[PDB]
Structures are given as structure tokens and as C-alpha cells.
From a paper:
[name] and [name] are two homologous membrane proteins (∼50% sequence identity in humans) that reside in the endoplasmic reticulum (ER). They both consist of an N-terminal membrane-bound domain with three predicted transmembrane helices, and a C-terminal cytoplasmic region, which encompass ∼50% of the protein and is predicted to form a coiled coil, or more likely two coiled coils. [name] controls the fates of its bound clients, which may be either retained in the ER, progress through the secretory pathway or be extruded and subjected to ER-associated degradation. The structures presented here now show for the first time that the [name] domain adopts a dimeric coiled coil fold with no structural similarity to DED domains.
The structure of the [name] domain of [name] was determined in two different crystal forms; P21 at pH 8.0 and twinned P3221 at pH 4.2. The [name] domain forms an uninterrupted parallel coiled coil dimer in both structures. Almost all residues could be modeled in the P21 form (172–233), but not in the P3221 form (169–220). Apart from that, the two structures are however quite similar and exhibit a RMSD Cα value of 1.12 Å for 94 aligned residues. In contrast, [name] [name] forms a coiled coil over a wide pH spectrum although the melting temperature is 11 °C higher at pH 4.2 than at pH 7.0. This dramatic increase in stability is puzzling since there is no clear evidence for any substantial charge repulsion in the dimer interface at pH 7.0 (though Glu-174 may perhaps cause some level of repulsion), and since very low pH may in fact destabilize the 2–3 inter-helical salt bridges that are present in the domain through protonation of acidic residues. A possible explanation for this is that the loss of ionic interactions at acidic pH may be counteracted by favorable interactions between basic residues and anions present in the solvent, reminiscent of the counterion condensation observed in double stranded DNA.
Author numbering:
A (entry chain A): 169 to 220
B (entry chain B): 170 to 219
Write the structure that this text describes.
């Protein structure tokens, strides 16, 4: 039935959009954390070179 | 209205493809984060002795 297929797709689509928003938020945060960690590595390199 | 079902199928395909890509980018970024944090810890140790 067209009605059944449509309802199933609408349900999947609502569920996928919520999963997508979650993953988008998690990605943005993880990327920000990676940038921080990499800049930590660089700051420590300079501090370890300014000491040694 | 006539296009209702195919548009839903198209959206569905679009979302599923985006979902897989984001899961892939997330796992890759998480792995890089783990490596960088581990570099920080390794460098903390070498800095400790000196």
C-alpha cells in the first residue's frame, strides 16, 4: 500500500533527521576538541624547546 | 502530492547517505583526537623527567 510505505518512510525520515542532528553536534564538538589537542601539542613543543 | 512517495524515497536515500558519511567522519575525527591526546600524555612524561 502507498499509505503504508509513506508512513514507514516518514517515520524513518524523522528518526534519521534526529540521528543526523546528533551526529552533526558530536562532529562539531569532536573537531573543536581535536583542534584544541593539536594546539596543545604545538604549545608544548614550543615550551619544551624554550626550556631545552 | 503526485510526487509524494518518490520525494519521500529521495529524502530517505539522502538522509541515509548523509548518516553514513557523518558516522565515518565522526569515527575518523575521534581516532585523531585519541592520538593527539595520547601525544599530549607522552609529552607530559618526557617533560616530567627533564
Amino acid at each position: 500500500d502507498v499509505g503504508n510505505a509513506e508512513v514507514k518512510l516518514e517515520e524513518e525520515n524523522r528518526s534519521l533527521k534526529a540521528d543526523l542532528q546528533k551526529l552533526k553536534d558530536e562532529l562539531a564538538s569532536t573537531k573543536q576538541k581535536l583542534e584544541k589537542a593539536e594546539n596543545q601539542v604545538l604549545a608544548m613543543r614550543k615550551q619544551s624547546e624554550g626550556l631545552t
